[PDB]
Amino acid sequence: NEDMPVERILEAELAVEPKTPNDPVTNICQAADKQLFTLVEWAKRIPHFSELPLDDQVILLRAGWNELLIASFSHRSIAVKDGILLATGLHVHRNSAHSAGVGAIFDRVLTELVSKMRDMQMDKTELGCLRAIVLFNPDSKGLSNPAEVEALREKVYASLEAYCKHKYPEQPGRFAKLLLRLPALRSIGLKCLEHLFFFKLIGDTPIDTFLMEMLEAP
Amino acid sequence: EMIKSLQHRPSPSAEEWELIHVVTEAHRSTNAQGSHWKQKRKFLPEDIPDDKVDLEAFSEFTKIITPAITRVVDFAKKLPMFSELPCEDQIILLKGCCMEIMSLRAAVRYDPESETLTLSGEMAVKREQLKNGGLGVVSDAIFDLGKSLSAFNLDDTEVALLQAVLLMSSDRTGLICVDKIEKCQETYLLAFEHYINYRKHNIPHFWPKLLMKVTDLRMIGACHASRFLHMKVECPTELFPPLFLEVFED
Ligand SMILES: N[C@@H](Cc1cc(I)c(Oc2ccc(O)c(I)c2)c(I)c1)C(=O)O
Ligand SMILES: CC1=C(/C=C/C(C)=C\C=C\C(C)=C\C(=O)O)C(C)(C)CCC1
């Protein structure tokens, strides 16, 4: 039942997340670089992540970093009206996004992610779990034994479903309402990555060390 | 307790069976070839892109695609909480989910002995054939889902309910009913969960394992849109049926 403890997962979230240039695209890139450090910390603090081969740990984090970071900033922004809150304490607004041309994907984030997490009042335990389900992706190319990864993902499905039924018995379809936020994140995360490479090539947007390392081959 | 507790993993709570039945039949009537799709199976003769579109295989698709989109419309029409939706709001939902439902409808008719999907229940096509005829790498994506969904042993109700879920996405651009559409999906999911509990599949974690396929479908949709733009370059817009243009152009 708890071969993946929701409390151990919620703890990872709290261990990295605290309590609540000019170019928005550059500011977001700065935030992303800082968070790539914290991301690996959070990852190691998730049950059984550190037990996988070191190359697999990399494979998984290299694969889901975008979606993970997107989810994490989107949940922090639940308060932040019409805009997004960065890990650098900075705020980026809908209008400023449009000015940078990035208004289309930004509107998608605010709507499909922030709004939906806000409307449903998504807690940090569920967030952690969704992020953990994204982390544990067996479909990732090159991992030595994906069955271990798949098993760990299945372990999160179980624990998250269990927590949902326990903490929210009134909401009988909360667990599916949460899982259905993942197609939106997969879709959004993919377009954000495209823009990132488009901005990486133009050269005009300054991408820091870790973010760069993600945007290049290993 | 124990007894009070052992009323866990529920089955469809009465009204849910009315819903299950309306939808199961909405999909049953709209699923082109019914119980005789294996019997009425017409293999496409060996003629087969990632663009460089094989117009001979593309033509056979453009033929059958006009009724296919229509069925995806018919099914939605029959669902009462959809029928009750505004002019705009229900066209946005119909545009967004069209290809998802079509791919899902195609993927469920995959047979591994022959390595073929069955378009509109009439035409059986191979991986190379669907690719070269305009779908390109979207073909592999549909084929791979057909392999993946085979283990799930989905039935007419499962499919019908998945279709209703794909249709009721509150995460589409420019929606005004919103919560009205969101609660429609909420009800349909709850029923789908219960029907799944009732079905008792030989698969552990079936419900989440299934719901994750929504991403695969959502992605088959998104790639189709880009794959359509590449078709538009490689064409003639006159080759595209007006309905196909209605759904996909914009
Ligand atoms: N088979 C489904 C309906 C369905 C019909 C056809 I033609 C299909 O192929 C496509 C679709 C879009 C395209 O642009 C091209 I080029 C080919 C698929 I995938 C599905 C059913 O049974 O309802
Ligand atoms: C390339 C790009 C984007 C990608 C951002 C990504 C991939 C991560 C952001 C992480 C942050 C912002 C972390 C944090 O604050 O903790 C978005 C669409 C959002 C803005 C414009 C273009």
Q: Which domains does chain B have, with CATH numbers?
A: 1-250 (1.10.565.10)
**Residues 103-122 of chain A whose Cβ lies under 8 A from any Cβ of chain B:** 111-112, 116
User: Cβ(A59)–Cβ(A143) under 8 Å?
Assistant: yes
A68 touches ligand 2 (CB under 6 Å): no
Looking at the complex, does the CB of residue B15 fall below 8 Å from at least one CB of chain A? Answer: no
β-strand pairing of A91-93 with B42-43 = unpaired
Q: Rounded CA gap, B97 and B99, in Å? A: 6
Residue type, B153: N
Looking at the complex, does the CB of residue B4 fall below 8 Å from at least one CB of chain A? Answer: no
B135 touches ligand 1 (CB under 6 Å): yes
Q: Which ligand is nearest to the CA of A18?
A: 2
CA of A178 relative to ligand 1 center, distance in Å: 30
Elucidation method: X-ray
User: Cβ(B56)–Cβ(B144) under 8 Å?
Assistant: no
Q: What is the resolution of this structure in A?
A: 3.0
B97 touches ligand 1 (CB under 6 Å): no
β-strand pairing of B123-125 with A83-85 = unpaired
CB atoms within 10 A of CB B169: 22
Give Cα A165 distance to the centre of its chain. Answer: 24
Tokens describing residue A195? 């823009």
Q: DSSP strand E in A98-206: where?
A: none
SS3 A5: coil
How buried is residue B7: exposed, middle or buried, by Cβ count under 10 Å (0-12/13-18/19+)?
A: exposed
Phi-psi region of B205 (alpha: psi -120 to 50; beta: other; left: phi over 0): left
How buried is residue B160: exposed, middle or buried, by Cβ count under 10 Å (0-12/13-18/19+)?
A: buried
User: Cβ(A6)–Cβ(A162) under 8 Å?
Assistant: yes
Q: Rounded CA gap, B34 and B30, in Å? A: 9
Question: DSSP labels for A17-29?
Answer: PPP----HHHHHH
User: Cβ(A31)–Cβ(A73) under 8 Å?
Assistant: yes
List chain A gaps (C–N > 2.5 A) by preceding residue. 20
Q: Rounded CA gap, B236 and B55, in Å? A: 11
Which of B190, B215, B218 lies closest to A173 in CB terms? B190
Which of A173, A186, A187 lies closest to B193 in CB terms? A173
- Chain B residue with minimal CA distance to A155? B205
CA of A29 relative to ligand 2 center, distance in Å: 6
List of long-range contacts for B173-177, beta carbons under 8 Å, 24+ apart: B173/A111, B173/B92, B174/B88, B174/B92, B175/B89, B175/B92, B175/B93, B176/B86, B176/B88, B176/B89, B177/B85, B177/B86, B177/B89
Across the interface, whether the CB atoms of B218 and A116 are under 8 A apart is answered: no
Q: Rounded CA gap, B217 and A183, in Å? A: 9
CB atoms within 10 A of CB A73: 22
User: Cβ(A68)–Cβ(A39) under 8 Å?
Assistant: yes
Q: Which ligand is nearest to the CA of B74?
A: 1
Q: Rounded CA gap, A38 and A34, in Å? A: 7
Q: Rounded CA gap, B130 and B64, in Å? A: 13
Q: Rounded CA gap, A136 and A133, in Å? A: 5
Which are the contacts of A53, defined by CB distance < 8 A and separation ≥ 6?
A144, A145
Q: Which residues of B touch A183 (CB under 8 A)?
A: 171, 214-215, 218-219
User: Cβ(A24)–Cβ(A92) under 8 Å?
Assistant: yes
**Residues 42-61 of chain B whose Cβ lies under 8 A from any Cβ of chain A:** none
A94 is in an annotated binding site: no
Which are the contacts of B149, defined by CB distance < 8 A and separation ≥ 6?
B107, B108, B110, B213
Per the annotation, binding residues of B are: 71, 120
Which are the contacts of A145, defined by CB distance < 8 A and separation ≥ 6?
A53, A56
Q: Distance between the two ends of chain B, CA-based, in angstroms? A: 56
Domains of chain A: 1-218 (1.10.565.10)
Q: What is the 3-state secondary structure (H, E, C) of chain B?
A: CCCCCCCCCCCCCCHHHHHHHHHHHHHHHHCCCCCCCCCCCEECCCCCCCCCCCHHHHHHHHHHHHHHHHHHHHHHHHCHHHHCCCCCHHHHHHHHHHHHHHHHHHHCCCECCCCEEEECCCEEECHHHHHHHHHCCHHHHHHHHHHHHHCCCCCHHHHHHHHHHHHCCCCCCCCCCCHHHHHHHHHHHHHHHHHHHHHCCCCCCHHHHHHCHHHHHHHHHHHHHHHHHHHHHHCCCCCCCHHHHHHHCC
Q: Rounded CA gap, B104 and B123, in Å? A: 16
Q: Rounded CA gap, B163 and B203, in Å? A: 21
Q: Rounded CA gap, A74 and A82, in Å? A: 12
Give ∠ CA B227-B239-B55 in degrees, rounded to 5.
Answer: 70
Looking at the complex, does the CB of residue B214 fall below 8 Å from at least one CB of chain A? Answer: yes
Q: DSSP strand E in chain A: where?
A: 83-85, 91-93
- Using the atom order of ligand 1, give the atom closest to the CA of residue B120: 22
Across the interface, whether the CB atoms of A176 and B207 are under 8 A apart is answered: yes
